Amino acid sequence: SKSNQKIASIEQLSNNEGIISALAFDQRGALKRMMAKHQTEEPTVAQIEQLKVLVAEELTQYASSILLDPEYGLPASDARNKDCGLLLAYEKTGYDVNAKGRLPDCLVEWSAKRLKEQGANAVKFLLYYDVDDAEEINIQKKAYIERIGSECVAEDIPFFLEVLTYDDNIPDNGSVEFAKVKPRKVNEAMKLFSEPRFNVDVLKVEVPVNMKYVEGFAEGEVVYTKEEAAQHFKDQDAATHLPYIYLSAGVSAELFQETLKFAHEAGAKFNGVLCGRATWSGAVQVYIEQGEDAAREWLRTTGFKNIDDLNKVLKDTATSWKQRK
Amino acid sequence: SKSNQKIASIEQLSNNEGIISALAFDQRGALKRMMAKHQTEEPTVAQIEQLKVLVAEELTQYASSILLDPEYGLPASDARNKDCGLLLAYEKTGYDVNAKGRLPDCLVEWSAKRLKEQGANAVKFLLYYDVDDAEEINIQKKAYIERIGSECVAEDIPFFLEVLTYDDNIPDNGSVEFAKVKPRKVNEAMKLFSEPRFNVDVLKVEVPVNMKYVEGFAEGEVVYTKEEAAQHFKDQDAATHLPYIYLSAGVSAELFQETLKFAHEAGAKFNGVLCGRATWSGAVQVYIEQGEDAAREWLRTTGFKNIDDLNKVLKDTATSWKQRK
Ligand SMILES: [Zn+2]
Ligand SMILES: [Zn+2]
Numbered sequence: 001s002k003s004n005q006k007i008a009s010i011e012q013l014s015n016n017e018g019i020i021s022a023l024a025f026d027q028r029g030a031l032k033r034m035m036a037k038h039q040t041e042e043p044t045v046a047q048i049e050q051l052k053v054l055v056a057e058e059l060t061q062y063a064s065s066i067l068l069d070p071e072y073g074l075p076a077s078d079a080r081n082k083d084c085g086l087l088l089a090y091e092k093t094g095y096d097v098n099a100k101g102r103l104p105d106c107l108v109e110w111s112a113k114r115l116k117e118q119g120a121n122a123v124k125f126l127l128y129y130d131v132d133d134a135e136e137i138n139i140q141k142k143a144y145i146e147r148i149g150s151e152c153v154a155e156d157i158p159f160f161l162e163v164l165t166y167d168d169n170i171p172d173n174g175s176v177e178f179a180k181v182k183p184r185k186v187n188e189a190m191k192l193f194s195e196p197r198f199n200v201d202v203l204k205v206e207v208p209v210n211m212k213y214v215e216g217f218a219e220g221e222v223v224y225t226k227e228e229a230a231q232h233f234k235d236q237d238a239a240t241h242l243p244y245i246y247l248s249a250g251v252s253a254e255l256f257q258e259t260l261k262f263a264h265e266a267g268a269k270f271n272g273v274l275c276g277r278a279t280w281s282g283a284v285q286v287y288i289e290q291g292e293d294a295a296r297e298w299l300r301t302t303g304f305k306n307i308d309d310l311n312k313v314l315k316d317t318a319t320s321w322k323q324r325k
Numbered sequence: 326s327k328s329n330q331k332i333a334s335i336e337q338l339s340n341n342e343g344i345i346s347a348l349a350f351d352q353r354g355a356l357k358r359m360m361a362k363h364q365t366e367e368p369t370v371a372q373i374e375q376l377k378v379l380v381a382e383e384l385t386q387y388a389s390s391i392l393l394d395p396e397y398g399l400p401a402s403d404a405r406n407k408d409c410g411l412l413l414a415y416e417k418t419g420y421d422v423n424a425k426g427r428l429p430d431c432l433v434e435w436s437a438k439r440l441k442e443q444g445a446n447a448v449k450f451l452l453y454y455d456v457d458d459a460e461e462i463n464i465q466k467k468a469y470i471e472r473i474g475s476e477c478v479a480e481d482i483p484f485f486l487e488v489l490t491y492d493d494n495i496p497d498n499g500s501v502e503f504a505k506v507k508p509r510k511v512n513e514a515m516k517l518f519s520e521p522r523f524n525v526d527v528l529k530v531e532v533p534v535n536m537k538y539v540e541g542f543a544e545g546e547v548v549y550t551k552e553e554a555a556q557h558f559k560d561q562d563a564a565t566h567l568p569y570i571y572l573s574a575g576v577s578a579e580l581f582q583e584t585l586k587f588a589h590e591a592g593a594k595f596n597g598v599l600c601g602r603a604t605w606s607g608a609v610q611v612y613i614e615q616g617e618d619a620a621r622e623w624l625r626t627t628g629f630k631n632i633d634d635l636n637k638v639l640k641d642t643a644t645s646w647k648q649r650k
């Protein structure tokens with residue numbers, strides 16, 4: 001029984017079939033790491049704002065919505081296509097490697113009310129979550145999400161909760177050891193944050209396996225057979241009643257496309273994507289080394305190919321956010 | 326047009342005339358400072374919980390509600406009189422003297438939803454605010470209060486905002502220099518936090534003058550005449566449309582009583598009090614030095630006299646929270 005305004009706002013984030021075919025560019029710390037590979041200087045605010053503007057200007061005509069951060073992304077939000085909706089990120093970027101727990105913390109100048117006043121159709125918040133963590137840590141995380149979920153009810157604005165999994169006992173997310181526990185980490189977190197007390201509207205989540213270790217896709221060690229990986233997608237689908245969409249996690253455009261196909265064939269009725277680096281990552285080096293004009297040209301050719309190829313796959317694979325179990 | 330449930334909850338916090346005749350004991354850091362004057366050991370959790378229990382057991386029959394903190398005050402909340410309502414504090418105790426700005430920060434395990442689930446009839450949050458501070462500091466404070474105000478709308482629970490004033494240029498609140506600016510600091514903060522965007526239900530505030538420097542009350546220097554002090558109370562009344570109640574700030578029971586009379590004669594239509602140390606402060610030394618039985622005896626004699634004398638003054642001076650301008 002979702003409120004009329006929350007329904008209306010999620011319609012504004014979705015395409016004409018109800019698929020969330022969204023473009024993600026709220027990267028801050030992560031964008032700076034990408035830029036640091038191609039220049040010796042620290043990135044400027046102006047530089048970062050302008051790169052986000054280029055992506056919004058060139059690619060939002062092909063997206064149903066764009067996710068931006070309010071620290072650098074407000075000029076880009078003004079530049080978005082007239083039919084493209086807006087999500088704004090609410091968490092501070094990254095986490096303190098020297099503090100235990102990756103504890104969640106909102107941007108200090110912002111509230112759900114102020115994000116709505118900037119024109120957001122949704123508030124997005126990223127939480128790092130390990131279901132096996134100490135309860136002393138996880139209680140703080142549950143309480144924090146309850147606050148944000150309550151703010152978004154009062155402000156009558158959809159709450160998109162992004163969950164990224166981790167385990168302090170397995171510090172490398174990309175490892176074989178992490179790949180074995182990932183389905184559990186992802187699916188259990190979804191079960192928890194689907195509880196009504198968190199007031200989440202849409203979950204933005206990882207695919208439950210690391211595809212780099214799935215039979216057929218794997219160039220090295222194989223952690224799961226195709227049958228095993230497919231079952232992890234089925235378990236993910238059963239973990240929530242809420243609409244859920246996938247993040248790209250910086251894999252190649254082609255691997256992300258083949259992942260969505262695999263999810264669909266396995267029986268995950270995912271409702272779209274918030275796809276960032278798989279679409280636009282190549283623009284960063286071009287912008288730095290060649291300049292603005294060359295970056296625009298990259299976005300009009302390769303960027304366009306990446307998002308158009310993605311949209312074609314979504315048409316065949318994704319399910320309206322309104323579909324009910 | 327307050328919601329039905331918020332109205333019902335504030336009725337539960339008020340007496341049969343609609344006056345908030347409430348008992349405050351959410352002190353944590355401040356209570357420890359009081360206890361440290363009478364023992365060499367650091368206070369224990371068990372010790373602090375039990376002192377709050379004694380106050381709830383002996384005095385809540387004479388109060389319309391009690392304000393407690395969720396860190397030590399939950400056993401005391403269970404012990405309150407059946408007709409006495411409950412407010413729970415949401416902020417961490419005190420502030421970091423080594424960090425600039427006294428920036429607001431909720432208790433990490435709590436949310437408005439969880440406070441409501443403990444049986445609170447209201448959420449109370451303390452904000453330290455200097456209207457003359459840098460905007461870089463104050464924007465964070467406004468954003469933070471907007472979040473809490475929004476949570477309390479969603480959870481349909483009254484939001485009591487306590488404001489304490491300060492000025493980093495005048496580090497001693499109790500000084501003559503601070504006394505001169507206090508009315509401005511207090512009244513301007515009330516004007517700001519009465520804006521609809523903060524969703525405050527009731528303001529808990531300081532009296533706008535330091536009575537220790539008002540003509541007639543002053544033993545030393547006189548900062549304001551009686552006429553001048555009376556006008557500051559009139560300005561306070563005009564600063565808000567919301568119900569507002571006074572905190573005691575640890576003055577004597579008799580001075581607090583004469584302050585409420587002065588406010589009333591000046592034309593401040595205050596709606597009650599959240600009175601803490603003026604009522605129970607003497608119990609702390611007795612509990613530590615003499616023990617539990619002696620503390621109960623103090624509460625049944627002097628404690629009772631203090632709260633009963635206060636209730637008599639409130640009957641003559643305070644206005645229903647429902648009164649409209
Ligand atoms: Zn390079
Ligand atoms: Zn993301």
Ligand SMILES: [Zn+2]
Pocket residue numbers: 264316317
């Ligand atoms: Zn198909």
Ligand SMILES: [Zn+2]
Pocket residue numbers: 362363610614
């Ligand atoms: Zn003593």
Ligand SMILES: [Zn+2]
Pocket residue numbers: 349451487572
């Ligand atoms: Zn107080």
Ligand SMILES: [Zn+2]
Pocket residue numbers: 589641642
């Ligand atoms: Zn009178």
